[model samples]
Target: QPEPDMITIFIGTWNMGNAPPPKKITSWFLSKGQGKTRDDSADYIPHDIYVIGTQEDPLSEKEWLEILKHSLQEITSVTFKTVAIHTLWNIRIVVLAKPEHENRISHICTDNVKTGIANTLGNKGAVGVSFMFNGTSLGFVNSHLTSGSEKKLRRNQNYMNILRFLALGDKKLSPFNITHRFTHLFWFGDLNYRVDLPTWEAETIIQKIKQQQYADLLSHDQLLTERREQKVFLHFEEEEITFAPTYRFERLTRDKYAYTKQKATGMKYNLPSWCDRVLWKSYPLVHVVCQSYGSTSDIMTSDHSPVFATFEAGVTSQFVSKNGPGTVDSQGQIEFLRCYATLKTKSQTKFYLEFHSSCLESFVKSQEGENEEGSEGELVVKFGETLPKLKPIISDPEYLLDQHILISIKSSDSDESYGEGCIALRLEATETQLPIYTPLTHHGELTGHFQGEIKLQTSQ
Candidate 1:
């Protein structure tokens, strides 16, 4: 199988609590426990994409951008440019990409969903940015949901509101489900979900946090329970919590939970929780591997510790067939034979097929008449009783020989996997049209069958 073209992405979220930018904020941009010494280590390597989301931020948008660019300059050699940034009052999300991808990324757009105060105010809501990165559609949402330990239901409602109202891309385009619109979507920020334990029990567990005993406390986590019950973030995935809670910390204090007392009762009322978090969901064919997930504990400017996650995101390759004497054949079509699938259960299913080829070049080619510049090839097709022909702009037919095409059949409604099949293209044959077929299987059980033909015609 051909390996995917992968790029590094760094995602970080923080609830600034209306705090100003600190003098030294580079710690939040680096890996956990990494120092400022410039070396050839992986820790110093800059990510291809950096997404920073902040809630209750006090700085203006311009001020925040300046601070971010300056701080990022101190860490890596590659220059980063702001691809998109949106602010909804105190909540803001900024997306930055390296210089090398300036032309490859396109369709940049931003939208905000207001869940605050009758869904009109921006005090507690989300700001989002969605764009085409190479051939993949990606989105990032930074939200500040309802706070308070007893407001789990309200937080869940806030999440649903965002999903219902937030729209990306051109307003004139037909409306589709946001979850299904992007190939990969990332949602992170001050989620504000709390621990379900009593205040005393929660504080008591904090002492054992240093000993790495978090299972008991995490069992009552409201977010985890909501996810397990399929109440919110249904398909999103979060890395296991190896770090401590990120909320209710003492301002200007390192590793200290807030211990504020109430006037009526001289007891600590603030409960520490993992309120700030990062989670993502991606299409089955795309490869999104989380390399690191942790909180930056060194920055004590805010009452909440900033959380960070690094991912190796994949970009699909586009192959164009080449004509004789340096001429190129840009127009071609791949025809699909009638696909058949029989599930274990008897129910109507919206089945789809994803065709991913190995990455040949580091970047996608901008084909003429697709988008002004160029875009990645369309690699997905949804079929039920009928199959649709796919038009992929091709360049080199020789590169297709011996290369494998991975096809995965999945139910679109439930995001369930039916099975996967792999087939190789041998264009060395004399025939202009090549036919192929592969059986799909799941867990050693035959589930379905897919057959297709590749037709790359030379321009005469």
Candidate 2:
């Protein structure tokens, strides 16, 4: 059967104050709370990827874990999460699951690494998380930017340092490692760049990430909506409706100018805005699926709706067909026969190679006290680059040359060792790999593992 063509991603962000469903009208259900709304939904499928607002919750991690497990239920087979640095101060990054996802993943993190403030900066401040799915790896940074009281330089610097952490791979400002695992990376969260934009430093930030070949996940339309000077949008374009005081203004004071977003065309005032986002690296599978900035009238769940994207372990153009030439040339056939004649030669070569490498290394350490004849000058008599990748085999066939030179090498302990080949009962190879293994172990007579050796002198 063919594999799936698309991978779905679902994410929801909620800011649970001291109590969820707040003890006021909705009677606080301290146990499960609103987690179920996000985790269980017919339309809300287990996202191939998931991320959430994992703030300090005022609730404990143990309680959170219990609630989390209950919320996840029959959904999300693959799960990963990110927590705050010192106190794990109520922030986290998470990924959901898909049965097909390959588990080979590598992660980088910085929990309690002190950043200048010894008394203030223990190991818990900034945190960065990364993982892979559908062939692309992503990194989500929990950035709680500095509050208003701090100076611009200090504010930006502190956040910039966190970015610098991501700017350098999050492990500590270094380039991404290619051979580790996974092919792509993404970083996103509350980046307070609007504060840094006047000087084009924001452009510098974009350019910096672009220099590393990372591009924003949105298409042209999404950028157009966010490009306006006034940060207002009609909820998901439900209508041209808009609003004012587009930012976090506690009260409408004389300094705080208020305006309705109704004037903005192609807007959805019904949506939520948990602003700030990021993309650390780019990949072929990424696509923008949803945004909370617009109307999600059905969800009275959280104040902010998470941005969602579906990433697939997309197929690239590098695949090659394994079918070889229909047949070997007569000359090539003759050449194979010739090798068979000298098969013993290859065997002898093999025998010596094995005998000299390790077995020989386990030799005597002779002193120059008495003339050492046997150890005269440990002559270079053998060498082996790779041990027989499978065990040697001696097979007894039921048929002869008249019927067929059939030989079978039964399975043996040493024969199964793909690391090094050793004498066994029988050996054969049908395939170099079997899909069931992570590194993949071989099976069946097709794979020459333990079965020993086989030979036929030809019938007279």
Candidate 3:
């Protein structure tokens, strides 16, 4: 596999309101709580991918980036490198890839979907980016949704609008894969979904949040219900949050929620909610597990506390040969090492594969049909009943054993159901059809799938 079994990823979102952000902001990305007296030391290890999304009205985009670069270098002693940077009015997204894996970034495509003032401005929008790592594809979106507790439908509409209509590239408005395009995807920002509870009851939930029992109140989350109803983000999953509310907080204070000033009576009112969030979705070939999701309250520049989520994503090994590595030449038999067959036909049918093989020496003979007169014969294998329409299907005709050969399957079905899915395989003798006896050859096969990309790690 080009990538390791797992890669650590870091995501952060903050709304800066166009001001010169606090210098302590970088420290919030590093540790938790105030300086000196802070008890717990948060993990600060440099991640494989670092993504920062900001509602920028920063001192300057370039200047803020320089400051952020310096701060990150100071924190990690310069092990990270900036690979991607984008700015669209008030919203910005930046990506920093680890040096060792930086070259793996093959292509990058970005699009900004606006749902803000007049539907033309970027005051409320998502900046999306997709890229290829090794052979795996991944996507990331940094968004700021519509505000107001009652604008739930508008928020849901904005979510779909971003995915449905986003376009990337330059010069012309060319379309790119915006919705569920990559192998794995992450969407994080201020979703603006509010607490459904009444004021007094919401405050009661806030008190419970301070007591570290926020899960008891999570039942009142509007976003969760919207998710349950399929109003937005249909298949995405979030890290279970244990942190306090991330929105409606006061600046320069520690661990205190904000209160809105009543215009006539000069009274204060506050309804705290977890408006900031991190959510993820993935294809069957990709696996992502969230390690932690929380908020940092020490850096009080914006009314909203910055949120962070760390994920470990596993890259599914895409292609391999089953049964020990066997060569399909004159010296060896026509071994059916491995192949991917999807059951999309519904009416079961058999398919036949034929390949040509030749022998030059007297000692070596073709294994297709008993090596008639010691020469060459065509290699033919009977593929019984397990096939979707093979369209340019055979991965490699040369039959190179271990170069990650793959049998591509094209199917229209949305479901992934492969019969005899986890069937074990071994190289077999041509005549006997029994396991070929070799010097301790390893045998393996992988579980089959049809919904998304087929992955064969060669493990039964």
Candidate 4:
């Protein structure tokens, strides 16, 4: 039988406190050397969905998006397109996805509530996004609740208010509410939930954690207590908090706990707590498996540590088709063989081209289209005056699933315009009204016009 689409996702949340990001991103996202290395191998894989949430003044929210994008690009070569981004006051959320699957995301909507002052300021509260992934509805909530002791009720109210904003009720595509609309939903960020114990008792829990009896400490976790009492996050599921507290750390220190440095700084060193967290809700059609959950101790840029979690969400599908048996729908899901090239040219006459395509094209000619005007695939190449003349190498039946075409360039063509310019190529569609268009699919820098090696070049 056809299996469900099992997708991998990585979720990260931090509270920057208006602090600027450093020149380099040396956190758990990297391979090593930043934080004590996490043994979970899932951190090293490239996930299909990447989400990040942070609480900061709204002034630099857009800049945060760009910084996060570049940092993730350094780790993976996949062309990630921003799917959803929203900023409400100090809370910001951004999600990136690979291009191939981005089209499946739709019905996008975001909402935010102000709970800073008199419930009207933009400094606190929550902002979230709801969208349909493939045919499954999913929601992501990034929130910063009311802080301080004896504010459990206020924090619970904050969670309830945010759910209303993220919920999707009365929508044609998704009839379920936010809490039930998703095959799987992820809620994360700085919740600001504090420890309820006295200072001395809180220190005892910290000592218990250091003694390798972390579960003992979890008994007094404010968030966990609320959930157990049916006061908040009634049905949400969270991964075990095996790591140390992720809140109230000293700035510029190496793995320094908040309580240890509190007295010296003369600042209210709130008892260290796991204020940052990730939680999820799942429907029967989806099974969520958390592979890893922890915080990066090396990241001392903020008072609160950034926490991340990796999960495998197995989402079921009912749109299967019968072709004998065990055949899934493959009508419009065609895999095309794409090629990449890196060109280094010293002389216009003698240019070297390295061409590669990741996977072989496996296409099913199950769909047909208009083919008037004697369909013939044409190739266009531009390198200034050096190589202006280019010809098509595909005739009738112009483009096939696994067909490869060549570009015939005239040796007689050469101009000063081509001395050292950028090279661009595209496979032009000539009067062939097909479902998709075929472009050059391959082009790299000619000489110093671009950076990095040549291959599947989209955004430089």
> Model 4, 389-447: lDDT tens per residue?
11112221212122221221122233112211112222233232222221111111122
Q: Which regions of candidate 1 are displaced past 4 Å? A: 1-4, 33-40, 116-122, 170-175, 259-269, 317-460
Instruction: Compose the digit string of candidate 2's lDDT tens values, residues 1-460.
Output: 3433345443333333234422121111111121112222333345444444343245565555545544554333334342222224555454434434534333444332123365546322344555533223345445544322122234345443554343322232111121111233333333322222223233343343334322221211121233342222111111111211012211312122111233531231211112334333222122333222221222223332223222332311111112112221121100001110111011111111111111011211111111111233321111111222211111111111111111111112232211111221111321221111011011110122212123222111
Candidate with top TM-score is 1
**How well does candidate 1 match the true structure in TM-score terms?**
0.71
Q: Give residue 386's error in model 2 in angstroms.
A: 36
Which residue pairs in model 4 clash with each other?
A: 385-415, 385-418, 426-440
Distance from true location, Cα of 260 in model 1, Å: 5.2
Better of 2 and 4 by lDDT: 4
**Which tens-of-lDDT digit does each residue in 1-460 have in candidate 1?**
4423788788889898888867887767775732111223675688889999999999988999888887787788666899998998889999988887887789898999889575535488898999876556788889999877878888988888887688884343222335545667889999998877776665586786767677887898899999988778866799888788888887897567774456632353657788988899775445788887878767888888888888888765433344422342344334444334333434455555555543222111111111011133222232322444433334344343424445556565765556555555544452265666665654323455555555433222
Error of 1 at 445 (Å): 28
Assess each prediction's global lDDT (C-alpha) against the native: 0.68, 0.27, 0.56, 0.56
Candidate 3's TM-score reads 0.66
User: Which pairs clash (backbone N, Cα, C closer than 3 Å) in model 1?
Assistant: 319-395, 320-394, 320-395, 320-396, 321-394, 321-395, 321-396, 322-395, 366-374
